[PDB]
Write a protein that binds this DNA or RNA. Sequence first.
RNA 1: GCCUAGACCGAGGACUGCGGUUUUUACCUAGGAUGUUGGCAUAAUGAUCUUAAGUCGCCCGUCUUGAAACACGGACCAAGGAGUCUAACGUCUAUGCGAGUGUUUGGGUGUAAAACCCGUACGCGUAAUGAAAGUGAACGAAGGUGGGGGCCCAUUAGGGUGCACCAUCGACCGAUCCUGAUGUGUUCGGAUGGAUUUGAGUAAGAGCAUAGCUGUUGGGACCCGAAAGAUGGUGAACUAUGCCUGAAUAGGGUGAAGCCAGAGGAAACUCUGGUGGAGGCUCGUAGCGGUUCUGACGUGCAAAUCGAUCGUCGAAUUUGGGUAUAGGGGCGAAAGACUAAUCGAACCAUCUAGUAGCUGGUUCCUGCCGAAGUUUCCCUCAGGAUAGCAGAAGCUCGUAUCAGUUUUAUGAGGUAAAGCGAAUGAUUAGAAGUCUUGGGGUUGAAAUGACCUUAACUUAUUCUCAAACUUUAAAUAUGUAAGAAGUCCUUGUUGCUUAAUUGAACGUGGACAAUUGAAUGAAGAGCUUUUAGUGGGCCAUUUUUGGUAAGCAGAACUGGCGAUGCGGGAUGAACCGAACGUGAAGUUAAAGUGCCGGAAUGCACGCUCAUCAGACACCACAAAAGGUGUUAGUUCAUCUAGACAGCCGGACGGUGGCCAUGGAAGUCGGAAUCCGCUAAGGAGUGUGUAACAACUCACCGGCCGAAUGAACUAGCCCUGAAAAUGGAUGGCGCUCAAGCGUGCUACUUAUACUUCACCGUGAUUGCUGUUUUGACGCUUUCACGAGUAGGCAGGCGUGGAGGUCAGUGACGAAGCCUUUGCUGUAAAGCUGGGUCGAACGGCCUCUAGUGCAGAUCUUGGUGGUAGUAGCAAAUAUUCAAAUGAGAACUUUGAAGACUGAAGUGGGGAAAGGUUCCAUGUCAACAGCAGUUGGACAUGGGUUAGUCGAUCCUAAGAGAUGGGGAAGCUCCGUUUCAACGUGC
RNA 2: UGAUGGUCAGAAAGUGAUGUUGACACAAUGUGAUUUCUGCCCAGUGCUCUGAAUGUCAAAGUGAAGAAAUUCAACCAAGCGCGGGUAAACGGCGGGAGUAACUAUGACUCUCUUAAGGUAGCCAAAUGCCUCGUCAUCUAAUUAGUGACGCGCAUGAAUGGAUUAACGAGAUUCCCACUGUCCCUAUCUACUAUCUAGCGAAACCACAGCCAAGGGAACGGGCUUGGCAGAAUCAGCGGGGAAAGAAGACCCUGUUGAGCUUGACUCUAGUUUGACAUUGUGAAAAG
RNA 3: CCUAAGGGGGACUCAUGGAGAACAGAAAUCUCCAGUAGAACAAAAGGGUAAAAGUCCCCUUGAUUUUGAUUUUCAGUGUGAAUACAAACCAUGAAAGUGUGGCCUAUCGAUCCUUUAGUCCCUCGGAAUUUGAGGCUAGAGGUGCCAGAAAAGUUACCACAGGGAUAACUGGCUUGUGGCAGUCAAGCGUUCAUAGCGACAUUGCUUUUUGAUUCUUCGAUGUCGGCUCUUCCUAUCAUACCGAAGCAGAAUUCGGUAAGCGUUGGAUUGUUCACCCACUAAUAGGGAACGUGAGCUGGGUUUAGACCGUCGUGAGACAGGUUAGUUUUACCCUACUGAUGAAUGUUAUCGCAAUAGUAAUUGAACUUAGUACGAGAGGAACCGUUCAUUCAGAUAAUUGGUUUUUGCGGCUGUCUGAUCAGGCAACGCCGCGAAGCUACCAUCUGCUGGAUUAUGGCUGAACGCCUCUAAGUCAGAAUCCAUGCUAGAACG
RNA 4: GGCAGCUCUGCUACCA
Length: 63
Amino acid sequence: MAKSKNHTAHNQTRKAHRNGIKKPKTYKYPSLKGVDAKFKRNHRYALHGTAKALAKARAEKSA
RNA sequence: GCCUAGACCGAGGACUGCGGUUUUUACCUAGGAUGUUGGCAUAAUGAUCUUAAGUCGCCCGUCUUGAAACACGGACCAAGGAGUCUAACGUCUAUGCGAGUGUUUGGGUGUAAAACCCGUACGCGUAAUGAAAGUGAACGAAGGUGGGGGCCCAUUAGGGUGCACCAUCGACCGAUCCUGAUGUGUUCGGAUGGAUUUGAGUAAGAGCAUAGCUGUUGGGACCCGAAAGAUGGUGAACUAUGCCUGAAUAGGGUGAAGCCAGAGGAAACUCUGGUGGAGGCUCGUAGCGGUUCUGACGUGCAAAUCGAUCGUCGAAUUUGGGUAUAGGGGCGAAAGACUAAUCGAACCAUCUAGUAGCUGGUUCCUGCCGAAGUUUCCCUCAGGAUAGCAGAAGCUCGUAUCAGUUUUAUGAGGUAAAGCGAAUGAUUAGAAGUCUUGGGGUUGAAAUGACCUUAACUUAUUCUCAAACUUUAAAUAUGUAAGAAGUCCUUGUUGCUUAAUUGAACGUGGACAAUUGAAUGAAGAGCUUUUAGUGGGCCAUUUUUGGUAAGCAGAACUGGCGAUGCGGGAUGAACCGAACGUGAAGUUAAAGUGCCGGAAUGCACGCUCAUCAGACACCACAAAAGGUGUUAGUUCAUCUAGACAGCCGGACGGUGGCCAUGGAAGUCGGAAUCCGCUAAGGAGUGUGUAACAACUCACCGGCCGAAUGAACUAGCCCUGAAAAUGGAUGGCGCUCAAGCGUGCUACUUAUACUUCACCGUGAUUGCUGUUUUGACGCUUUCACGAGUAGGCAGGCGUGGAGGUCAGUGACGAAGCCUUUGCUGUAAAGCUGGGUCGAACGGCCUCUAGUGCAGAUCUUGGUGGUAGUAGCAAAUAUUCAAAUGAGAACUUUGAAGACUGAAGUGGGGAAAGGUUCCAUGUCAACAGCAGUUGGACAUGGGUUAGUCGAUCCUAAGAGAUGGGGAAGCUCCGUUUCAACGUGC
RNA sequence: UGAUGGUCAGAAAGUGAUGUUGACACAAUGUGAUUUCUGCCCAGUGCUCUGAAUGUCAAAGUGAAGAAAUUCAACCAAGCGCGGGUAAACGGCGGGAGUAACUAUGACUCUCUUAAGGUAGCCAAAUGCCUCGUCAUCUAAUUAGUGACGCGCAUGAAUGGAUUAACGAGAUUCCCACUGUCCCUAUCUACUAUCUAGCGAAACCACAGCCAAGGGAACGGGCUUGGCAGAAUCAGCGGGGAAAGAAGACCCUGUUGAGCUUGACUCUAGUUUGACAUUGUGAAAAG
RNA sequence: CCUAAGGGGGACUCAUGGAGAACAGAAAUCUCCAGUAGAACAAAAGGGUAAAAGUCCCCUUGAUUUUGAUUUUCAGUGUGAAUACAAACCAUGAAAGUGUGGCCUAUCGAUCCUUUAGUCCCUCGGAAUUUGAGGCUAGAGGUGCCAGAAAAGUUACCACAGGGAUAACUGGCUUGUGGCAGUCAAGCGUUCAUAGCGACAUUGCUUUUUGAUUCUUCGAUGUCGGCUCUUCCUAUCAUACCGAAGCAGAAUUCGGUAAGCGUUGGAUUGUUCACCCACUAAUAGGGAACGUGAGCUGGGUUUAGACCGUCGUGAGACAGGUUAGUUUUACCCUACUGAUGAAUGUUAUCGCAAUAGUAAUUGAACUUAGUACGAGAGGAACCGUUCAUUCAGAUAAUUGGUUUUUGCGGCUGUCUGAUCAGGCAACGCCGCGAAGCUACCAUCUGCUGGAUUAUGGCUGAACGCCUCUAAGUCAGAAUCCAUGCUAGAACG
RNA sequence: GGCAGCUCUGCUACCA
Ligand SMILES: [Mg+2]
Ligand SMILES: [Mg+2]
Ligand SMILES: [Mg+2]
Ligand SMILES: [Mg+2]
Ligand SMILES: [Mg+2]
Ligand SMILES: [Mg+2]
Ligand SMILES: [Mg+2]
Ligand SMILES: [Mg+2]
Ligand SMILES: [Mg+2]
Ligand SMILES: [Mg+2]
Ligand SMILES: [Mg+2]
Ligand SMILES: [Mg+2]
Ligand SMILES: [Mg+2]
Ligand SMILES: [Mg+2]
Ligand SMILES: [Mg+2]
Ligand SMILES: [Mg+2]
Ligand SMILES: [Mg+2]
Ligand SMILES: [Mg+2]
Ligand SMILES: [Mg+2]
Ligand SMILES: [Mg+2]
Ligand SMILES: [Mg+2]
Ligand SMILES: [Mg+2]
Ligand SMILES: [Mg+2]
Ligand SMILES: [Mg+2]
Ligand SMILES: [Mg+2]
Ligand SMILES: [Mg+2]
Ligand SMILES: [Mg+2]
Ligand SMILES: [Mg+2]
Ligand SMILES: [Mg+2]
Ligand SMILES: [Mg+2]
Ligand SMILES: [Mg+2]
Ligand SMILES: [Mg+2]
Ligand SMILES: [Mg+2]
Ligand SMILES: [Mg+2]
Ligand SMILES: [Mg+2]
Ligand SMILES: [Mg+2]
Ligand SMILES: [Mg+2]
Ligand SMILES: [Mg+2]
Ligand SMILES: [Mg+2]
Ligand SMILES: [Mg+2]
Ligand SMILES: [Mg+2]
Ligand SMILES: [Mg+2]
Ligand SMILES: [Mg+2]
Ligand SMILES: [Mg+2]
Ligand SMILES: [Mg+2]
Ligand SMILES: [Mg+2]
Ligand SMILES: [Mg+2]
Ligand SMILES: [Mg+2]
Ligand SMILES: [Mg+2]
Ligand SMILES: [Mg+2]
Ligand SMILES: [Mg+2]
Ligand SMILES: [Mg+2]
Ligand SMILES: [Mg+2]
Ligand SMILES: [Mg+2]
Ligand SMILES: [Mg+2]
Ligand SMILES: [Mg+2]
Ligand SMILES: [Mg+2]
Ligand SMILES: [Mg+2]
Ligand SMILES: [Mg+2]
Ligand SMILES: [Mg+2]
Ligand SMILES: [Mg+2]
Ligand SMILES: [Mg+2]
Ligand SMILES: [Mg+2]
Ligand SMILES: [Mg+2]
Ligand SMILES: [Mg+2]
Ligand SMILES: [Mg+2]
Ligand SMILES: [Mg+2]
Ligand SMILES: [Mg+2]
Ligand SMILES: [Mg+2]
Ligand SMILES: [Mg+2]
Ligand SMILES: [Mg+2]
Ligand SMILES: [Mg+2]
Ligand SMILES: [Mg+2]
Ligand SMILES: [Mg+2]
Ligand SMILES: [Mg+2]
Ligand SMILES: [Mg+2]
Ligand SMILES: [Mg+2]
Ligand SMILES: [Mg+2]
Ligand SMILES: [Mg+2]
Ligand SMILES: [Mg+2]
Ligand SMILES: [Mg+2]
Ligand SMILES: [Mg+2]
Ligand SMILES: [Mg+2]
Ligand SMILES: [Mg+2]
Ligand SMILES: [Mg+2]
Ligand SMILES: [Mg+2]
Ligand SMILES: [Mg+2]
Ligand SMILES: [Mg+2]
Ligand SMILES: [Mg+2]
Ligand SMILES: [Mg+2]
Ligand SMILES: [Mg+2]
Ligand SMILES: [Mg+2]
Ligand SMILES: [Mg+2]
Ligand SMILES: [Mg+2]
Ligand SMILES: [Mg+2]
Ligand SMILES: [Mg+2]
Ligand SMILES: [Mg+2]
Ligand SMILES: [Mg+2]
Ligand SMILES: [Mg+2]
Ligand SMILES: [Mg+2]
Ligand SMILES: [Mg+2]
Ligand SMILES: [Mg+2]
Ligand SMILES: [Mg+2]
Ligand SMILES: [Mg+2]
Ligand SMILES: [Mg+2]
Ligand SMILES: [Mg+2]
Ligand SMILES: [Mg+2]
Ligand SMILES: [Mg+2]
Ligand SMILES: [Mg+2]
Ligand SMILES: [Mg+2]
Ligand SMILES: [Mg+2]
Ligand SMILES: [Mg+2]
Ligand SMILES: [Mg+2]
Ligand SMILES: [Mg+2]
Ligand SMILES: [Mg+2]
Ligand SMILES: [Mg+2]
Ligand SMILES: [Mg+2]
Ligand SMILES: [Mg+2]
Ligand SMILES: [Mg+2]
Ligand SMILES: [Mg+2]
Ligand SMILES: [Mg+2]
Ligand SMILES: [Mg+2]
Ligand SMILES: [Mg+2]
Ligand SMILES: [Mg+2]
Ligand SMILES: [Mg+2]
Ligand SMILES: [Mg+2]
Ligand SMILES: [Mg+2]
Ligand SMILES: [Mg+2]
Ligand SMILES: [Mg+2]
Ligand SMILES: [Mg+2]
Ligand SMILES: [Mg+2]
Ligand SMILES: [Mg+2]
Ligand SMILES: [Mg+2]
Ligand SMILES: [Mg+2]
């Protein structure tokens, strides 16, 4: 009495290709989410020290 | 290179350009048609209306995969008729002010619901976070890195600065967890430093208010629609049942008790004849009922009747009036029956516009874009939410680095195929070995020690298989890469890592410049918000599952239909071709070219003849098996040392060898079988004798001479081949086709392609010292145009409002009718003529009860049907006169009839209410008529001490004293009463 | 059910029906004249009966702990549970093998098992599937009728069994009579229909109205291809208009109902049981 | 399901086969050799595993704590499950290491409420103390319809909104099944495959069976059967003409052209179907919306009443039996059957014939003839003759039926005073009754040519023969077309 | 899930 269509993938690639299928954008810096915490913890200290060294190097060349 | 025939078109509107010839600051064919002539202007020309001809054209709206449907609504017309308003909101936009913002609760004021003015509070915002106690946002130029429009310096490039914004690493505030300083109401405090944790935060505020569209929720909620539910009332004039008081019921039959007489008997008792008049007895009227014809009728005489037939007919009978019982109630000799045409829960009003995931409807035009039937969840499966698909608004930028594609490089796979003397599983046949750990038999007097056999295993082989087997293993499809965010050199940071000076990650500085590292393309890339419809699908090729199959059910990929017209397939949602603005010319696609029908009875090679031919994919059917029909092949074989066929000789022998016994020289029949001259043939092939015969042989002869036989293959045709109205290669018809196979030339024509005109959309060129009273404008160029549901835009029309035209109008507003026309793609606007009589319009804005073909829509009106169905029960009318305009129907007379005293007579109860009577009178009514009437009009008319009511009480109804009940009111009827308006 | 009652009514009442009543009565049911009979089962579900002792067991009350709220414990009514009765209460009333000097059957025996295992009767019956059972009768022929039979799907005793004179607009079979029911139709009468004068509706209606085939929502009036096709019409007729009448009453769906039932879920009038209050005055005895 | 079947470490090698050892054997235990796993690993199946993941031994609790990230299903939500780390604390091992349950792929659960653990922290808001209560973080108690309401029936008294999204007819696709027909040819048939049959197989047709499906119809297409009537099909029962036989005759069987023509009366049953009786030339099968209900009927089915049996506690059910149960409308269009009719200068008479329709059918008796044939038993046919069946078209002499001839007569009741003569009895009744109508209940009439089918032939090639055929040709069926019969085109 | 008697019968109770 209520037997209908069960499943069909007909027309699904047509709909996917109207506005897709879009590749994700790439960025210079990926997010570090999921990267090892021990590496991420230390990587914070390495970047902080790098900024200090560059700041001092420029501070030498200013006054 | 040259000559030559025809057709269609003429956009643009001073000049500017590119070229050419230069005889030249000139001319040209070179950035789009001019010249000339005739005719006509009472007309050649154009438009519309009507009609004919040719061709095409199914009925709209609706739900649907699919509608012209034998699906639903729609007889017709007019007027009305359906997304509204409000509270609170999301996005976006406009506006004012802006770390603020909002005057309008209120006060002041007023030309008085207006306008104008005022301010405290309060709301929202400016701070978050935690359940809370509580705590509460700068290490730094409010941080670093990579981009980033613009600006600055430059001078391709390059450098500086870089807002918004993007990615990323940090910092700060709150919560959570860890650590725990000086100290202390010794249990508090919480400094300091941390943590793959967490917040709708900070990190130089952005909000508030008003308005508009769209979307949301609650409200009647786009309009119309339940079956139901509740509250409060009204009914027992029908009917059901009880009660009270009345009334009604021919004529027969039968013949119970009791009684009288006679007869018999010892008694107990018996018999006979009368009489009598019983009975929920019986025949049968009135009455009450309602069996059958399943009669009539069945838009009726009638929302239950009519006729005949029938049940019952002295009681559980029939019936009037009074009275009681009332809706989850009554009443029921019980059928869920009856309770006013209403009953498995009456009627009335209200709650109530009840709710509906369901059906129906949903009103102007054009332009642009344009779907889904799929994912997940849901008492979900006719519904929603969610994601997707779609529109709109845009925003940041301007070739940055993207793609339903290829190439090159490099991965993954276990399907097709293949395999099985490869694993697993299935499976056919032999062969060789061992049985010593198989039986039977035969050896053995007994030795388990041989042999014959089958069956087992073993070995090397053999035939055939697998979706849930496999060593191997495609095609198609699929992942990644092809640089500047790259490569190389040097050396900075860390608490991570190393034995380390090693690495990891991120960096400073330097080098490699457009061949910056494959192709092809790119109406540009990126980003955001918000919202519609949809969430039944179906079809075709190929893959594929279930099923005998199905126009069946279920999947995969793609393309379609839905949502889509156009040319072809006669016809047809989907097939082939091709997708669509309005046109002109040319050419085609698919399909065709005998006629219907535009284009060949065209050119060509063959095949086929059907006493059911055949005739074009999807597709509208035919098979196995057959044919000395005909055609073409293949392989054998015989052939001029005369093939097959036919006319004509022979085939003598050894030997009549043998057996069957009627006889075998083959021949009722049988095993068999050697030798002499021939161009030739045997102890014999059929025919023939019971037999010897004799013929032909099996061969070779003569006669013309040249082809012949067998098996097989596949073309067309034929057999196989049977269905129901007459009938379909679409029809006619077609036979060296107008059929079948194949080739060729030309030709025909789609909304397709090419060139051109015009419309619109998108983009694009330029336009201010000539911008010049339109820059929301003008202008250059190119591309494009299908569309249901749906979105958006620009317009048309209607009622009313502010403003304006010092607008139109009684010398004619508005309305209405009309081949009077004009304008617009259109919605529509304007106008000529006629009619008409008092108001009305244009423009800029505001506002809404604003647009109809549908809703078995509402109300009103009108058709076809159609002068049709019909006006046929109750026996029946006729002549004359009178009256009158008029006589089937009135009156009177004469006649003929009927009811036939249980009447068609004479009165009454209920109910009606003037219908009664006289006079006048015919518009309507009396389903014909009408002089008549219960019609219409004017008058008149009902007389009581004795006839009724009035009085009595009946079943019952109902005050009081009282007692309940919130109360409307309920009980009770002399009741727990000091009860006389006493005589 | 003996009235301080049974059955029933009312919101309540100093309220009602039966009841102007009293077991030969009132109330509640079942079966359904007469005749002959009404067998077995009290395990189930009901109904009913006692409670000397007794599991569960509410509120109030009692005792203990606690600062109290509170908690815990004992006691603890009816009901239920326990025990008995009751079938003219609701109802129920069995299977498997062997066996007799042929065969068949099974008087008889064995075996499982119940509360009891269908008794007297009756039957292919209005109750029997198989089934049109088998035999007889009725007929030329009988799925009908009647009489028998009975391992009876699934007969059976006041959920009444078996009969039964009389009665029946009840259902059925046969026979006589009778006939147009029929062979097989014909004829006649009145009223219609018909025609006229007068009068004059309604249903229904997208547009309409000739066929055959095709395709098509798979049965066309319309479309395609054919056949064809000539005004205006009257009486009849019932092939078609998938004719009209009614938003299918069958079926399914809906998170739509309603009537009815019960051991559905959730309650409830009534009734019953306890406590407190109304509620006072004495005596005695047990705690 | 598992305190190991989790975790770590170590040692060993499994299934099975062969050869050997007292009882001991096919299977006890021991030994050696071979042994790629042919074993085992809790449980389905697949993958995985050999100094192991298997077997045995030793030690253990990492099946622990904190909170993030990720994969699958996915909306990139939840739940389940899993992965890689961070920070602890541990187990094990010499150690490197490994371990966040089970070698991997399944083995599970929100809000509200309750309860426990933790922090012993926050709150009970006029201020405190102690009980009590409420919060915060993590488990547990559960929804199996497993993203998670709290839930029994019946309706044959029924209602509403809808649905052809969906069943009960027809129709359409299909044709398994039903029915019918072929091909091959092992056998049957005294012999002998094919006169007649025909196994094992195999190819079809049909839509007269029943399924399968669910395309149409649920704002309705009237659902059984019979009666009535017309038509069509052929897969032919009879009738015409023929071919074949295991055809002597008679009968019968097989087959061809053939649907022209017929195919019945009854008992029982609602029946379709069936089954008997009987006649007959034969009693063939089907279709037309399973033809046919505004044609009927209404026995059946299938509303509501009622009974029984079985089932159910019950209301009730039964596709079981039984009895009673409203069958509506045509006047429209078309079509059919008949009937008029304008205009084809008027009117009249007589005609022609396009086209359409069509009609006859079957039997018996006599004769042939007791003949052919046959041993006999039996036993035909053609020519012919007389009748009959079914049908058709007329007709009314006769006979019968019918009577409003109300024609004549008769009869009852009543009315007109009697008589005569009449009236009435919703034609009063009866007998006869002409005329008209009418009946196989009566009588009459129902034609002869051509062309063919099957088939049998002639001449005659192909194919020097043969051959009914290929060219040509003969006869020939109830067939066809005419003749004859009916209408006459209203636009011949 | 509470009582109680003989691994258990009876009664009573029920917000995930
Ligand atoms: Mg679906
Ligand atoms: Mg021009
Ligand atoms: Mg056309
Ligand atoms: Mg619709
Ligand atoms: Mg449909
Ligand atoms: Mg339509
Ligand atoms: Mg149709
Ligand atoms: Mg319909
Ligand atoms: Mg509908
Ligand atoms: Mg209609
Ligand atoms: Mg209007
Ligand atoms: Mg604030
Ligand atoms: Mg706070
Ligand atoms: Mg900020
Ligand atoms: Mg309503
Ligand atoms: Mg309700
Ligand atoms: Mg009354
Ligand atoms: Mg009657
Ligand atoms: Mg009737
Ligand atoms: Mg009638
Ligand atoms: Mg009578
Ligand atoms: Mg009933
Ligand atoms: Mg009534
Ligand atoms: Mg409404
Ligand atoms: Mg729904
Ligand atoms: Mg488009
Ligand atoms: Mg749920
Ligand atoms: Mg629908
Ligand atoms: Mg494979
Ligand atoms: Mg696979
Ligand atoms: Mg394969
Ligand atoms: Mg291979
Ligand atoms: Mg193998
Ligand atoms: Mg939506
Ligand atoms: Mg949605
Ligand atoms: Mg569907
Ligand atoms: Mg659609
Ligand atoms: Mg198309
Ligand atoms: Mg076309
Ligand atoms: Mg075609
Ligand atoms: Mg034609
Ligand atoms: Mg032409
Ligand atoms: Mg054809
Ligand atoms: Mg054609
Ligand atoms: Mg042609
Ligand atoms: Mg468009
Ligand atoms: Mg208005
Ligand atoms: Mg003026
Ligand atoms: Mg005018
Ligand atoms: Mg005017
Ligand atoms: Mg005026
Ligand atoms: Mg104005
Ligand atoms: Mg309106
Ligand atoms: Mg209208
Ligand atoms: Mg009318
Ligand atoms: Mg008339
Ligand atoms: Mg009448
Ligand atoms: Mg009389
Ligand atoms: Mg009068
Ligand atoms: Mg009148
Ligand atoms: Mg008149
Ligand atoms: Mg009057
Ligand atoms: Mg008096
Ligand atoms: Mg008085
Ligand atoms: Mg009284
Ligand atoms: Mg009082
Ligand atoms: Mg009883
Ligand atoms: Mg009992
Ligand atoms: Mg009992
Ligand atoms: Mg208590
Ligand atoms: Mg007790
Ligand atoms: Mg018995
Ligand atoms: Mg019986
Ligand atoms: Mg019976
Ligand atoms: Mg009979
Ligand atoms: Mg019988
Ligand atoms: Mg019984
Ligand atoms: Mg008894
Ligand atoms: Mg009984
Ligand atoms: Mg009797
Ligand atoms: Mg009777
Ligand atoms: Mg009676
Ligand atoms: Mg008539
Ligand atoms: Mg068709
Ligand atoms: Mg037709
Ligand atoms: Mg039609
Ligand atoms: Mg036509
Ligand atoms: Mg009809
Ligand atoms: Mg009629
Ligand atoms: Mg409906
Ligand atoms: Mg639902
Ligand atoms: Mg309900
Ligand atoms: Mg009801
Ligand atoms: Mg272990
Ligand atoms: Mg393990
Ligand atoms: Mg180990
Ligand atoms: Mg996830
Ligand atoms: Mg899971
Ligand atoms: Mg506080
Ligand atoms: Mg307080
Ligand atoms: Mg839980
Ligand atoms: Mg739960
Ligand atoms: Mg669920
Ligand atoms: Mg679920
Ligand atoms: Mg039922
Ligand atoms: Mg359907
Ligand atoms: Mg079939
Ligand atoms: Mg078949
Ligand atoms: Mg043989
Ligand atoms: Mg169907
Ligand atoms: Mg229907
Ligand atoms: Mg019909
Ligand atoms: Mg109908
Ligand atoms: Mg035939
Ligand atoms: Mg024959
Ligand atoms: Mg015929
Ligand atoms: Mg009968
Ligand atoms: Mg049929
Ligand atoms: Mg039928
Ligand atoms: Mg009919
Ligand atoms: Mg009818
Ligand atoms: Mg009936
Ligand atoms: Mg009934
Ligand atoms: Mg019972
Ligand atoms: Mg009756
Ligand atoms: Mg003779
Ligand atoms: Mg007389
Ligand atoms: Mg008289
Ligand atoms: Mg009379
Ligand atoms: Mg006579
Ligand atoms: Mg010859
Ligand atoms: Mg011939
Ligand atoms: Mg010939
Ligand atoms: Mg004529």
